[PDB]
Structures are given as structure tokens and as C-alpha cells.
Tab-separated table of C-alpha atoms and ligand atoms in Angstrom:
chain	number	residue	atom	x	y	z
A	1	UNK	CA	-89.831	29.719	-41.981
A	2	UNK	CA	-89.114	25.918	-42.020
A	3	UNK	CA	-91.931	23.631	-40.872
A	4	UNK	CA	-91.903	19.967	-40.250
A	5	UNK	CA	-95.033	18.323	-41.171
A	6	UNK	CA	-96.364	15.304	-38.931
A	7	UNK	CA	-99.627	14.550	-40.738
A	8	UNK	CA	-100.974	15.802	-44.242
A	9	UNK	CA	-104.480	14.228	-45.161
A	10	UNK	CA	-104.441	15.605	-48.855
A	11	UNK	CA	-101.486	13.741	-49.942
A	12	UNK	CA	-102.619	10.470	-48.241
A	13	UNK	CA	-104.934	6.704	-44.601
A	14	UNK	CA	-108.465	5.514	-43.628
A	15	UNK	CA	-109.148	6.712	-40.074
A	16	UNK	CA	-111.661	5.605	-37.430
A	17	UNK	CA	-115.264	6.636	-37.629
A	18	UNK	CA	-117.489	6.430	-34.565
A	19	UNK	CA	-120.166	5.331	-34.649
A	20	UNK	CA	-119.279	3.308	-37.744
A	21	UNK	CA	-121.603	3.587	-40.752
A	22	UNK	CA	-123.523	6.733	-40.072
A	23	UNK	CA	-121.673	9.862	-39.208
A	24	UNK	CA	-118.347	10.819	-40.806
A	25	UNK	CA	-117.793	9.076	-44.119
A	26	UNK	CA	-115.031	9.100	-46.571
A	27	UNK	CA	-115.995	10.699	-50.059
A	28	UNK	CA	-114.354	11.311	-53.446
A	29	UNK	CA	-114.975	13.703	-56.444
A	30	UNK	CA	-113.144	14.339	-59.713
A	31	UNK	CA	-110.824	17.451	-60.662
A	32	UNK	CA	-108.049	17.960	-63.037
A	33	UNK	CA	-107.909	14.278	-63.781
A	34	UNK	CA	-106.901	13.516	-60.168
A	35	UNK	CA	-108.752	11.954	-57.182
A	36	UNK	CA	-109.872	14.252	-54.325
A	37	UNK	CA	-110.676	12.725	-50.887
A	38	UNK	CA	-112.762	14.193	-47.899
A	39	UNK	CA	-114.463	13.237	-44.866
A	40	UNK	CA	-118.175	14.410	-44.719
A	41	UNK	CA	-121.161	14.191	-42.476
A	42	UNK	CA	-124.628	15.968	-43.366
A	43	UNK	CA	-127.050	14.590	-40.429
A	44	UNK	CA	-128.889	18.048	-40.042
A	45	UNK	CA	-132.567	16.441	-40.010
A	46	UNK	CA	-131.549	13.873	-37.195
A	47	UNK	CA	-132.117	15.694	-34.089
A	48	UNK	CA	-128.971	14.685	-32.079
A	49	UNK	CA	-125.616	14.285	-33.669
A	50	UNK	CA	-122.513	13.049	-31.901
A	51	UNK	CA	-120.282	11.950	-34.869
A	52	UNK	CA	-116.475	11.512	-34.120
A	53	UNK	CA	-113.594	11.309	-36.634
A	54	UNK	CA	-110.105	10.281	-35.229
A	55	UNK	CA	-106.858	10.655	-37.016
A	56	UNK	CA	-104.475	7.765	-36.820
A	57	UNK	CA	-101.712	8.027	-34.229
A	58	UNK	CA	-99.300	10.973	-35.060
A	59	UNK	CA	-95.731	10.709	-33.825
A	60	UNK	CA	-94.703	13.641	-31.795
A	61	UNK	CA	-90.953	13.511	-32.458
A	62	UNK	CA	-89.394	16.322	-30.611
A	63	UNK	CA	-92.168	18.690	-31.677
A	64	UNK	CA	-93.083	20.864	-28.679
A	65	UNK	CA	-96.085	22.961	-30.121
A	66	UNK	CA	-98.046	21.684	-33.003
A	67	UNK	CA	-100.019	23.841	-35.624
A	68	UNK	CA	-103.246	22.483	-36.793
A	69	UNK	CA	-104.479	23.714	-40.206
A	70	UNK	CA	-108.001	22.826	-41.574
A	71	UNK	CA	-109.692	23.517	-44.759
A	72	UNK	CA	-113.349	22.732	-45.157
A	73	UNK	CA	-116.828	23.729	-46.387
A	74	UNK	CA	-120.202	24.263	-44.641
A	75	UNK	CA	-123.709	24.202	-46.134
A	76	UNK	CA	-126.344	26.818	-44.935
A	77	UNK	CA	-128.836	25.393	-42.473
A	78	UNK	CA	-131.348	27.350	-44.178
A	79	UNK	CA	-131.230	25.323	-47.444
A	80	UNK	CA	-132.415	22.130	-46.142
A	81	UNK	CA	-136.137	20.972	-46.450
A	82	UNK	CA	-136.123	20.163	-42.750
A	83	UNK	CA	-133.652	22.832	-41.982
A	84	UNK	CA	-135.058	22.888	-38.552
A	85	UNK	CA	-133.375	24.234	-35.301
A	86	UNK	CA	-131.579	20.903	-35.202
A	87	UNK	CA	-129.025	22.307	-37.723
A	88	UNK	CA	-125.610	23.632	-36.636
A	89	UNK	CA	-123.074	25.283	-38.800
A	90	UNK	CA	-119.878	24.300	-36.592
A	91	UNK	CA	-117.880	21.283	-35.400
A	92	UNK	CA	-115.328	20.784	-32.500
A	93	UNK	CA	-111.807	19.832	-32.573
A	94	UNK	CA	-110.154	17.714	-30.072
A	95	UNK	CA	-106.693	15.808	-29.303
A	96	UNK	CA	-105.166	13.390	-26.981
A	97	UNK	CA	-101.568	12.302	-26.248
A	98	UNK	CA	-100.498	8.762	-25.516
A	99	UNK	CA	-97.417	6.456	-25.400
A	100	UNK	CA	-99.062	3.811	-27.537
A	101	UNK	CA	-101.406	3.278	-30.242
A	102	UNK	CA	-105.005	2.712	-28.727
A	103	UNK	CA	-105.773	1.462	-32.303
A	104	UNK	CA	-109.665	1.074	-32.327
A	105	UNK	CA	-109.994	1.787	-28.666
A	106	UNK	CA	-111.216	5.277	-29.174
A	107	UNK	CA	-112.585	6.870	-25.985
A	108	UNK	CA	-114.209	10.327	-26.150
A	109	UNK	CA	-113.486	11.080	-22.216
A	110	UNK	CA	-109.879	10.839	-22.949
A	111	UNK	CA	-109.665	13.812	-25.498
A	112	UNK	CA	-109.448	17.399	-24.747
A	113	UNK	CA	-111.390	19.991	-26.654
A	114	UNK	CA	-109.072	22.495	-28.500
A	115	UNK	CA	-111.853	24.923	-29.755
A	116	UNK	CA	-114.802	25.251	-31.847
A	117	UNK	CA	-114.680	25.726	-35.559
A	118	UNK	CA	-116.839	28.161	-37.389
A	119	UNK	CA	-117.014	28.835	-41.180
A	120	UNK	CA	-115.290	32.062	-42.400
A	121	UNK	CA	-117.331	31.252	-45.681
A	122	UNK	CA	-120.655	29.352	-45.764
A	123	UNK	CA	-121.973	27.916	-48.855
A	124	UNK	CA	-125.248	26.957	-50.520
A	125	UNK	CA	-125.194	23.573	-52.069
A	126	UNK	CA	-113.557	26.839	-48.705
A	127	UNK	CA	-113.130	27.929	-45.045
A	128	UNK	CA	-109.478	27.785	-43.776
A	129	UNK	CA	-108.759	27.677	-40.028
A	130	UNK	CA	-105.620	26.971	-37.949
A	131	UNK	CA	-105.234	26.440	-34.338
A	132	UNK	CA	-102.190	25.105	-32.003
A	133	UNK	CA	-101.551	23.201	-28.908
A	134	UNK	CA	-98.626	22.656	-26.669
A	135	UNK	CA	-96.667	21.585	-24.823
A	136	UNK	CA	-96.739	18.183	-25.935
A	137	UNK	CA	-94.613	15.586	-24.168
A	138	UNK	CA	-95.599	11.984	-24.954
A	139	UNK	CA	-94.762	9.714	-27.880
A	140	UNK	CA	-97.666	10.473	-30.053
A	141	UNK	CA	-101.056	12.280	-30.154
A	142	UNK	CA	-104.404	11.896	-31.936
A	143	UNK	CA	-106.694	14.541	-33.351
A	144	UNK	CA	-110.358	14.163	-33.376
A	145	UNK	CA	-113.134	15.954	-35.111
A	146	UNK	CA	-116.720	16.100	-33.560
A	147	UNK	CA	-119.836	16.725	-35.349
A	148	UNK	CA	-122.770	17.867	-33.491
A	149	UNK	CA	-125.423	18.138	-36.416
A	150	UNK	CA	-123.983	20.016	-39.443
A	151	UNK	CA	-123.251	19.467	-42.986
A	152	UNK	CA	-119.304	19.734	-43.058
A	153	UNK	CA	-116.764	18.638	-45.735
A	154	UNK	CA	-113.464	18.233	-44.319
A	155	UNK	CA	-110.784	18.463	-47.282
A	156	UNK	CA	-107.551	19.233	-45.596
A	157	UNK	CA	-105.823	18.924	-42.388
A	158	UNK	CA	-102.026	19.607	-41.742
A	159	UNK	CA	-100.380	19.205	-38.430
A	160	UNK	CA	-96.839	20.769	-38.243
A	161	UNK	CA	-94.311	22.505	-35.942
A	162	UNK	CA	-92.132	25.389	-36.562
A	163	UNK	CA	-88.207	25.388	-36.555
A	164	UNK	CA	-85.457	28.032	-36.148
A	165	UNK	CA	-82.781	27.982	-38.842
A	166	UNK	CA	-79.256	27.372	-38.290
A	167	UNK	CA	-76.784	30.591	-38.387
A	168	UNK	CA	-73.448	31.821	-37.402
A	169	UNK	CA	-73.695	34.725	-34.999
A	170	UNK	CA	-70.629	36.430	-33.433
A	171	UNK	CA	-68.278	33.584	-34.408
A	172	UNK	CA	-70.686	31.182	-32.856
A	173	UNK	CA	-72.801	28.493	-34.737
A	174	UNK	CA	-76.248	27.375	-33.600
A	175	UNK	CA	-78.060	24.495	-35.261
A	176	UNK	CA	-81.674	24.069	-36.534
A	177	UNK	CA	-83.746	24.067	-33.027
A	178	UNK	CA	-87.419	23.330	-32.744
A	179	UNK	CA	-89.393	26.259	-31.792
A	180	UNK	CA	-90.438	26.420	-28.051
A	181	UNK	CA	-93.963	26.019	-26.916
A	182	UNK	CA	-94.546	28.907	-24.475
A	183	UNK	CA	-92.795	32.142	-24.139
A	184	UNK	CA	-92.632	32.292	-20.297
A	185	UNK	CA	-90.747	29.039	-20.400
A	186	UNK	CA	-88.264	29.539	-23.438
A	187	UNK	CA	-85.321	27.135	-23.174
A	188	UNK	CA	-81.700	28.524	-24.079
A	189	UNK	CA	-79.697	27.146	-27.053
A	190	UNK	CA	-75.935	26.792	-26.812
A	191	UNK	CA	-73.827	27.747	-29.778
A	192	UNK	CA	-70.318	26.406	-30.538
A	193	UNK	CA	-67.142	28.327	-31.460
A	194	UNK	CA	-65.938	28.573	-35.159
A	195	UNK	CA	-62.485	27.377	-35.798
A	196	UNK	CA	-59.802	29.512	-34.132
A	197	UNK	CA	-62.532	31.323	-32.051
A	198	UNK	CA	-62.981	31.218	-28.227
A	199	UNK	CA	-64.936	32.580	-25.362
A	200	UNK	CA	-62.521	34.734	-23.280
A	201	UNK	CA	-62.156	34.749	-19.560
A	202	UNK	CA	-64.465	35.466	-18.422
A	203	UNK	CA	-67.418	36.529	-20.718
A	204	UNK	CA	-70.715	35.004	-21.321
A	205	UNK	CA	-70.621	31.934	-23.664
A	206	UNK	CA	-72.807	31.923	-26.867
A	207	UNK	CA	-76.651	31.251	-26.285
A	208	UNK	CA	-79.964	32.112	-28.124
A	209	UNK	CA	-83.607	31.323	-27.892
A	210	UNK	CA	-85.991	29.593	-30.354
A	211	UNK	CA	-89.266	31.408	-30.138
A	212	UNK	CA	-92.751	29.916	-30.878
A	213	UNK	CA	-92.912	31.674	-34.252
A	214	UNK	CA	-89.911	30.056	-35.294
A	215	UNK	CA	-87.534	32.807	-34.778
A	216	UNK	CA	-84.244	33.361	-32.934
A	217	UNK	CA	-84.813	35.816	-30.100
A	218	UNK	CA	-82.303	37.017	-27.366
A	219	UNK	CA	-78.724	36.533	-28.445
A	220	UNK	CA	-76.357	36.136	-25.233
A	221	UNK	CA	-72.595	36.047	-25.009
A	222	UNK	CA	-70.228	36.104	-27.907
A	223	UNK	CA	-67.155	34.257	-29.377
A	224	UNK	CA	-63.877	36.190	-30.277
A	225	UNK	CA	-61.023	35.196	-32.574
A	226	UNK	CA	-58.302	33.583	-30.578
A	227	UNK	CA	-54.908	35.062	-30.075
A	228	UNK	CA	-52.769	35.007	-33.325
A	229	UNK	CA	-55.952	35.144	-35.156
A	230	UNK	CA	-58.346	37.792	-36.530
A	231	UNK	CA	-61.891	38.087	-37.824
A	232	UNK	CA	-62.278	38.283	-41.688
A	233	UNK	CA	-65.853	38.191	-42.675
A	234	UNK	CA	-67.362	35.218	-40.382
A	235	UNK	CA	-64.241	33.300	-40.093
A	236	UNK	CA	-60.973	33.681	-38.282
A	237	UNK	CA	-57.534	33.833	-40.267
A	238	UNK	CA	-54.195	33.738	-38.740
A	239	UNK	CA	-52.424	37.296	-38.427
A	240	UNK	CA	-50.219	37.949	-41.574
A	241	UNK	CA	-46.587	37.645	-41.291
A	242	UNK	CA	-45.249	40.846	-39.527
A	243	UNK	CA	-48.474	41.242	-37.376
A	244	UNK	CA	-49.589	40.067	-34.078
A	245	UNK	CA	-52.524	39.633	-31.659
A	246	UNK	CA	-51.573	38.848	-28.024
A	247	UNK	CA	-55.149	38.471	-26.583
A	248	UNK	CA	-58.345	37.368	-28.184
A	249	UNK	CA	-60.045	40.665	-28.797
A	250	UNK	CA	-62.166	42.272	-31.272
A	251	UNK	CA	-59.635	44.328	-32.742
A	252	UNK	CA	-57.523	43.478	-35.947
A	253	UNK	CA	-53.951	42.205	-36.020
A	254	UNK	CA	-51.400	44.904	-35.073
A	255	UNK	CA	-48.138	45.256	-37.059
A	256	UNK	CA	-45.005	44.320	-34.978
A	257	UNK	CA	-43.802	47.328	-32.701
A	258	UNK	CA	-40.115	48.939	-32.785
A	259	UNK	CA	-37.175	46.853	-32.433
A	260	UNK	CA	-38.672	43.473	-33.155
A	261	UNK	CA	-38.186	40.803	-35.639
A	262	UNK	CA	-40.495	40.192	-38.394
A	263	UNK	CA	-43.115	37.598	-37.226
A	264	UNK	CA	-44.240	34.424	-38.637
A	265	UNK	CA	-47.813	33.538	-39.500
A	266	UNK	CA	-50.400	33.723	-36.873
A	267	UNK	CA	-48.202	35.425	-34.500
A	268	UNK	CA	-49.173	36.305	-30.868
A	269	UNK	CA	-45.937	38.286	-30.234
A	270	UNK	CA	-43.062	39.727	-32.015
A	271	UNK	CA	-39.686	38.863	-30.556
A	272	UNK	CA	-37.244	41.627	-29.935
A	273	UNK	CA	-34.013	42.122	-32.120
A	274	UNK	CA	-30.547	41.297	-30.516
A	275	UNK	CA	-29.783	44.341	-28.170
A	276	UNK	CA	-33.212	44.999	-27.071
A	277	UNK	CA	-35.402	43.159	-24.323
A	278	UNK	CA	-38.756	43.151	-22.711
A	279	UNK	CA	-39.503	43.148	-18.929
A	280	UNK	CA	-41.854	40.768	-17.482
A	281	UNK	CA	-44.213	43.691	-16.381
A	282	UNK	CA	-44.067	44.611	-20.200
A	283	UNK	CA	-47.091	44.148	-22.380
A	284	UNK	CA	-46.342	42.418	-25.673
A	285	UNK	CA	-47.739	45.681	-27.300
A	286	UNK	CA	-44.908	48.074	-26.237
A	287	UNK	CA	-41.486	47.931	-28.367
A	288	UNK	CA	-38.541	46.035	-26.810
A	289	UNK	CA	-36.360	48.677	-24.777
A	290	UNK	CA	-32.769	49.023	-23.594
A	291	UNK	CA	-30.896	49.865	-20.487
A	292	UNK	CA	-30.081	53.567	-19.805
A	293	UNK	CA	-26.988	55.707	-20.406
A	294	UNK	CA	-25.202	57.023	-17.183
A	295	UNK	CA	-26.747	60.340	-15.631
A	296	UNK	CA	-25.812	63.170	-17.827
A	297	UNK	CA	-23.806	65.131	-15.380
A	298	UNK	CA	-22.984	64.874	-11.649
A	299	UNK	CA	-22.229	67.823	-9.239
A	300	UNK	CA	-21.209	67.484	-5.561
A	301	UNK	CA	-20.882	70.933	-3.664
A	302	UNK	CA	-20.083	70.182	-0.007
A	303	UNK	CA	-21.209	72.747	2.552
A	304	UNK	CA	-19.221	71.822	5.680
A	305	UNK	CA	-19.704	68.197	6.407
A	306	UNK	CA	-22.655	67.711	4.209
A	307	UNK	CA	-22.737	67.493	0.483
A	308	UNK	CA	-25.002	67.905	-2.494
A	309	UNK	CA	-25.134	65.383	-5.218
A	310	UNK	CA	-27.223	67.006	-7.843
A	311	UNK	CA	-27.827	64.964	-11.323
A	312	UNK	CA	-29.682	64.731	-14.564
A	313	UNK	CA	-31.512	61.851	-16.253
A	314	UNK	CA	-29.551	59.724	-18.790
A	315	UNK	CA	-29.055	61.298	-22.520
A	316	UNK	CA	-30.719	58.005	-23.356
A	317	UNK	CA	-33.511	56.439	-21.397
A	318	UNK	CA	-33.217	53.288	-23.106
A	319	UNK	CA	-36.983	53.969	-24.186
A	320	UNK	CA	-38.520	53.746	-20.540
A	321	UNK	CA	-40.055	55.873	-17.978
A	322	UNK	CA	-39.137	53.641	-15.115
A	323	UNK	CA	-35.476	54.909	-14.686
A	324	UNK	CA	-34.157	54.619	-11.102
A	325	UNK	CA	-30.819	55.744	-9.729
A	326	UNK	CA	-28.445	54.067	-7.183
A	327	UNK	CA	-25.588	55.716	-5.253
A	328	UNK	CA	-22.605	54.115	-3.649
A	329	UNK	CA	-19.513	55.715	-2.029
A	330	UNK	CA	-15.632	55.360	-1.669
A	331	UNK	CA	-13.781	56.368	1.553
A	332	UNK	CA	-9.284	53.105	-0.212
A	333	UNK	CA	-12.521	51.232	-0.397
A	334	UNK	CA	-16.247	51.401	0.126
A	335	UNK	CA	-17.787	53.694	2.941
A	336	UNK	CA	-19.211	52.280	5.911
A	337	UNK	CA	-22.313	53.085	7.755
A	338	UNK	CA	-20.532	56.374	8.658
A	339	UNK	CA	-22.146	58.376	6.098
A	340	UNK	CA	-25.927	59.399	6.411
A	341	UNK	CA	-28.136	59.571	3.218
A	342	UNK	CA	-31.090	62.173	3.230
A	343	UNK	CA	-32.984	59.344	1.615
A	344	UNK	CA	-32.428	55.624	0.999
A	345	UNK	CA	-29.584	55.509	-1.533
A	346	UNK	CA	-30.723	52.419	-3.561
A	347	UNK	CA	-33.834	52.718	-5.784
A	348	UNK	CA	-33.994	56.384	-6.077
A	349	UNK	CA	-36.523	58.361	-8.194
A	350	UNK	CA	-35.284	61.837	-7.332
A	351	UNK	CA	-32.260	63.374	-8.934
A	352	UNK	CA	-30.433	64.751	-5.594
A	353	UNK	CA	-29.418	63.450	-2.472
A	354	UNK	CA	-27.690	65.160	0.754
A	355	UNK	CA	-25.027	62.871	2.609
A	356	UNK	CA	-23.523	63.912	5.817
A	357	UNK	CA	-21.170	63.142	8.582
A	358	UNK	CA	-18.174	63.069	6.562
A	359	UNK	CA	-14.928	63.240	8.686
A	360	UNK	CA	-12.835	65.908	7.300
A	361	UNK	CA	-9.469	65.355	5.768
A	362	UNK	CA	-10.604	62.569	3.332
A	363	UNK	CA	-11.945	62.900	-0.084
A	364	UNK	CA	-14.702	60.438	-0.831
A	365	UNK	CA	-15.883	59.489	-4.349
A	366	UNK	CA	-19.522	58.848	-5.025
A	367	UNK	CA	-20.758	57.007	-7.892
A	368	UNK	CA	-24.358	57.293	-9.297
A	369	UNK	CA	-25.695	54.544	-11.590
A	370	UNK	CA	-28.917	54.826	-13.737
A	371	UNK	CA	-31.169	51.683	-14.277
A	372	UNK	CA	-34.387	50.893	-15.646
A	373	UNK	CA	-36.856	47.964	-15.620
A	374	UNK	CA	-34.682	46.252	-18.154
A	375	UNK	CA	-31.035	46.483	-16.613
A	376	UNK	CA	-31.639	43.250	-14.597
A	377	UNK	CA	-31.465	41.595	-18.170
A	378	UNK	CA	-27.705	42.723	-19.044
A	379	UNK	CA	-24.783	42.654	-16.846
A	380	UNK	CA	-23.176	45.993	-18.037
A	381	UNK	CA	-22.912	49.164	-16.047
A	382	UNK	CA	-23.801	52.852	-16.645
A	383	UNK	CA	-22.840	55.295	-14.030
A	384	UNK	CA	-21.385	58.683	-13.329
A	385	UNK	CA	-18.672	59.529	-10.628
A	386	UNK	CA	-17.835	62.569	-8.482
A	387	UNK	CA	-15.315	63.145	-5.614
A	388	UNK	CA	-14.970	65.665	-2.948
A	389	UNK	CA	-12.702	66.538	-0.059
A	390	UNK	CA	-13.379	68.961	2.616
A	391	UNK	CA	-10.507	70.835	4.094
A	392	UNK	CA	-12.134	72.165	7.120
A	393	UNK	CA	-10.266	70.323	9.867
A	394	UNK	CA	-10.738	70.864	12.593
A	395	UNK	CA	-12.014	73.105	15.436
A	396	UNK	CA	-8.955	72.616	17.808
A	397	UNK	CA	-9.561	72.116	21.490
A	398	UNK	CA	-7.988	74.936	23.368
A	399	UNK	CA	-7.043	74.950	27.026
A	400	UNK	CA	-4.458	76.536	29.325
A	401	UNK	CA	-1.816	74.790	31.461
A	402	UNK	CA	-0.110	77.686	32.915
A	403	UNK	CA	-1.014	81.270	34.308
A	404	UNK	CA	0.930	84.272	35.430
A	405	UNK	CA	0.433	88.005	36.433
A	406	UNK	CA	1.567	88.588	32.936
A	407	UNK	CA	1.933	85.563	31.089
A	408	UNK	CA	-0.631	82.795	29.780
A	409	UNK	CA	0.483	79.154	28.769
A	410	UNK	CA	-1.959	78.094	26.024
A	411	UNK	CA	-2.396	74.781	24.445
A	412	UNK	CA	-4.575	73.057	21.784
A	413	UNK	CA	-5.103	69.479	20.334
A	414	UNK	CA	-6.322	67.806	17.313
A	415	UNK	CA	-6.308	64.177	16.056
A	416	UNK	CA	-3.114	62.946	14.314
A	417	UNK	CA	-4.903	61.743	11.093
A	418	UNK	CA	-5.831	65.754	10.682
A	419	UNK	CA	-2.438	66.842	11.814
A	420	UNK	CA	-1.467	66.495	8.168
A	421	UNK	CA	-3.435	69.145	6.318
A	422	UNK	CA	-3.061	71.915	9.055
A	423	UNK	CA	-0.483	74.342	7.314
A	424	UNK	CA	-0.125	76.562	10.286
A	425	UNK	CA	-1.752	77.450	13.716
A	426	UNK	CA	-2.880	81.007	13.896
A	427	UNK	CA	-3.315	82.332	17.591
A	428	UNK	CA	-5.457	85.443	18.394
A	429	UNK	CA	-6.104	87.205	21.721
A	430	UNK	CA	-7.138	90.395	23.028
A	431	UNK	CA	-8.357	92.039	26.171
A	432	UNK	CA	-12.251	91.790	27.272
A	433	UNK	CA	-14.152	94.644	25.488
A	434	UNK	CA	-11.249	95.732	23.222
A	435	UNK	CA	-12.086	95.432	19.773
A	436	UNK	CA	-9.766	98.021	18.123
A	437	UNK	CA	-6.623	95.853	18.805
A	438	UNK	CA	-5.761	92.234	17.936
A	439	UNK	CA	-2.826	90.120	18.900
A	440	UNK	CA	-1.889	87.592	16.357
A	441	UNK	CA	1.107	85.030	16.095
A	442	UNK	CA	1.578	81.968	14.073
A	443	UNK	CA	3.356	78.561	14.517
A	444	UNK	CA	3.390	74.937	13.788
A	445	UNK	CA	3.548	74.045	17.365
A	446	UNK	CA	0.564	72.732	19.591
A	447	UNK	CA	1.472	75.147	22.544
A	448	UNK	CA	2.388	78.778	22.818
A	449	UNK	CA	3.090	81.111	25.775
A	450	UNK	CA	1.717	84.780	25.854
A	451	UNK	CA	4.174	87.215	27.140
A	452	UNK	CA	3.791	90.736	28.441
A	453	UNK	CA	0.395	90.907	29.760
A	454	UNK	CA	-1.593	92.864	32.446
A	455	UNK	CA	-2.588	91.168	35.706
A	456	UNK	CA	-6.117	90.307	36.728
A	457	UNK	CA	-7.581	90.589	33.148
A	458	UNK	CA	-9.748	88.132	31.091
A	459	UNK	CA	-8.340	87.654	27.630
A	460	UNK	CA	-10.180	86.139	24.492
A	461	UNK	CA	-8.238	83.345	23.093
A	462	UNK	CA	-8.964	82.049	19.377
A	463	UNK	CA	-7.023	79.415	17.617
A	464	UNK	CA	-7.497	78.648	14.034
A	465	UNK	CA	-5.932	75.634	12.287
A	466	UNK	CA	-5.635	76.955	8.644
A	467	UNK	CA	-5.740	74.522	5.705
A	468	UNK	CA	-3.978	76.070	3.861
A	469	UNK	CA	-4.671	79.656	3.686
A	470	UNK	CA	-8.086	81.369	4.738
A	471	UNK	CA	-9.667	77.885	4.410
A	472	UNK	CA	-9.070	76.462	8.031
A	473	UNK	CA	-11.145	75.552	10.842
A	474	UNK	CA	-11.550	77.935	13.856
A	475	UNK	CA	-11.789	77.233	17.542
A	476	UNK	CA	-13.865	78.102	20.432
A	477	UNK	CA	-13.277	81.576	21.837
A	478	UNK	CA	-11.902	80.751	25.205
A	479	UNK	CA	-11.477	82.981	28.224
A	480	UNK	CA	-8.451	83.005	30.425
A	481	UNK	CA	-7.129	85.267	33.102
A	482	UNK	CA	-3.880	86.566	34.407
A	483	UNK	CA	-3.093	86.307	38.191
A	484	UNK	CA	-2.788	88.872	40.997
A	485	UNK	CA	0.255	89.413	43.358
B	501	NAG	C1	-8.417	64.835	-2.108
B	501	NAG	O1	-7.113	64.215	-1.562
B	501	NAG	C2	-6.296	63.631	-2.797
B	501	NAG	C3	-5.428	62.667	-1.906
B	501	NAG	O2	-6.012	61.510	-1.801
B	501	NAG	C4	-5.690	64.700	-3.566
B	501	NAG	O3	-4.898	64.211	-4.467
B	501	NAG	C5	-6.644	65.726	-4.052
B	501	NAG	O4	-5.985	66.789	-4.332
B	501	NAG	C6	-7.663	65.914	-3.054
B	501	NAG	N1	-8.966	66.534	-3.531
B	501	NAG	C7	-8.766	67.670	-4.407
B	501	NAG	C8	-9.593	68.825	-4.226
B	501	NAG	O5	-8.025	67.432	-5.427
B	502	CL	CL1	-102.123	25.888	-25.949
């Protein structure tokens, strides 16, 4: 775990002693053909000791919490001739922040005690200890060591801050970040997106925290490979030629779908080969599709004035499920509003419709076309046709125009446009009650007189305009009556 050092006594500076002369004092020994320095003080006999040793001004840089490591020795208070109660076996560690170098202007009251330092190993004619303080927030700081009446040898001091390693995590890159001072107040570090990577709409953007111990803590958000690109190891390559990636996801590059042209490197979509198309609604994931073929077959059986257009889906959906049917009509020329559709005629999803109100004696032709969500792209037409004529025309209006004791003058009417079909007019009559005797005569006229009948009798008259045989339209059964003398 990287550590940045701000002050290292061992490598070596002549620090400030107070008071000067007595108290702390730089000293030297010999080892491995090399000089060894140390600040010592051994005033155990003397009743009251208050010896201060101050380190020169250390720059804080951007360090937030510093770690102080000390290596020292301590003699046993029981080994000195005096060795009275005036001998301690510990010393005190202080610090102070400032924006300028006080130089020689050392002032005890300005210092904050960090802790007392006690020997792990006491000797008789080396203890290692570490502490830390934060947060620091000024240009520089001092360290101060206080003697209270012991025999101490200070061999080493190191003050450093911990640091978080640079890394790449989820396509994001974070840089060396100074570790934080306190956990409850841990800042957040933004990461930047590797080439060809991005943060999608709208996920969390890359973040991570540098903990006191110099460790990366809680990873937030992530970067994904931009469209046209895919993740390989910890980088983003372009999609191979023949593949595509429309949205920035975690998935790999997909191969082009059906009916598409081989894509160039780093493709976000495969264009569709001539003959096929895609709708706006269509995702670039589905294959380009085609317009449908006309309905497979079409029937139109007309029960009276209504009719039943049944039909079946195209033999070729064009590769879609959004096929809708449209129905028009011929009467020549287009039908008016005269015809009623059981349902709206255009934009149908069913495969059968009932139209009604068809004036007899006219064959209409209905056309049904099938189209899908891609028909609007081409100007062709794919439809089926079916025609029907109802011959039932038309319930004649009967009424009399003359009466006698024995004869009835009967006449019927019917619009000229329909007087064409009518092959012959069948006239039927019989006395009331009688059901074993029928009187029937035919004619092309619109009037007839019934001869040789009984007086004061109601007759049943039924006229039927045949078209041509057994397929004609009957009339209301009227009731007329002879006259009395
Ligand atoms: C419909 O009338 C036409 C004349 O427009 C005729 O050719 C045809 O036979 C009729 N319908 C049928 C059942 O063929
Ligand atoms: Cl602290």
C-alpha cells in the first residue's frame, strides 16, 4: 500500500531544543561503518523535567491524516543510583498546525497532545510505536516531543500519509487518490470512461471512495461500451464486420439479422437488402420484413340483404404479426354510404365482416386488401376480390282498384330499376279458411282481374315476383272482399 513520506529523521536537520543546552540533545554512535543520529535526554535525577524537542516545519501537501512512527529506547528507572521517584519511563507526543514557519518562535501552549508513549521493551544500560492525527487543513504542521523526566533515546520518526492505487473498474478509470481522514466523512472520487465507453441514460456515473487504510471502498455506478463497440478484457473494441450493437449494453456484438447487408466495422445497425424494409416502430434487432400477400381466399354468401365476407390470412405474412385488412366496395363505381359495415371497414384485425342494406338487383364487388406495418413503405397493392348479386327483388305492393259481387280487380307495384329481373308475376288466392284449394295464375302485367267468385267473402291474395324461377320475392298476404247485392 503506497505511502508518501513527509518527514524521515533517520535519512537526515537540526531541530529546535527547548530549553537550549540541557534537555534533548543530538547524539551519535558507530555501526556498520555508518553514522547514526539520535535525540536523547537523561535527566532522571533532576526533580522536574519539561524538555521539548520540535521538528522543523513539515509541509502537509494534500495529506488528510498523517501517520507518525517512532522508534526509541528507554532505560529502567531502577538502574540509576539516584533512581528516585523522580524518574519516569514515558514521554509525550504533540503537534500543531500553522500556515507559516514559526521558526524559533516555539510556544508550548499552541500544541495539542496526541498521546503518551510507553515502551514496549524497557532496557538496562528498541520500542516501536505508531499514532495518527487528522484531519489536517493548513499549509504545514510541527511535531513536538516532551520529556518529563526519563532516559529516552529517539532513533527514528516517520510521518507519512496513505494512498489509494490507480485502477480501472467497470470500464472506468480512477486515479491515485489520497486516503480519507475519517470514515463518517469519506469523500467520493469520480472515475472517467475508457475510450469508446459511456454512462447510459440514466444509470449512476462511476464513483468510488478512498478509505483511511488506503483501500478502495464502495464502488458506485458503471461505464458500459458505447454502441457499435463491445467489451474485450478491460477495453472496448468495435464490432466485427457482420455484427452490430445498437445500444450500450453489457451484451456482446450480435450478428446481423435476416435479410440484411453485411455490416462494416463498428456497426450499430445492419441495413436491409433491397426488397425488405424496417418500420420506425421496429427495433434494429429484428430482421427487415416485407409486405403481405393478398388474403388467401375470400367468400361472400349473402343471406337476403346482408352478406358474409369471410377470408383467411395471407399465404405470406411478409414476416410480421401486425397484418390488418381493409375492405372497399363497387356498386359502375365505388359504393356510397348506402352500405353498412358491422365494423369499421378500414384497419380491421378480424377476418370476417357483415355488410347490409344492399338494394336488390345490383351485383356489388368487394375488395379486401391485406397490409402490415411495412406496406406504407411500398406503393404496391395486394388484395382479393369478390362479387355478389341478390336476385330477391322485390316484395310487391298489392292493392285493389275494383270490386264486384263476383270479381276483384287487383294491382301491384314495384320500382322500374327492378322491373328488369322479374321473369313473371305469380298471383295466388283462396277463400278464408280454405287450405285445400289454391288458385294460381301467372302474367307479366302489373294488374289482373279475378273472375267467377262468391259474393260477401274475404279472399287471401298473394303476389310473388319470381326471379327467375323459385327465387322471387313474395308480397304481403292482403285480404279483399267481394260485394253484396
Ligand atoms: C350480376 O349481374 C351481372 C350484370 O352486371 C351479371 O353479368 C351476373 O351474372 C350477375 N351475377 C352473377 C350471379 O353472375
Ligand atoms: Cl485523530
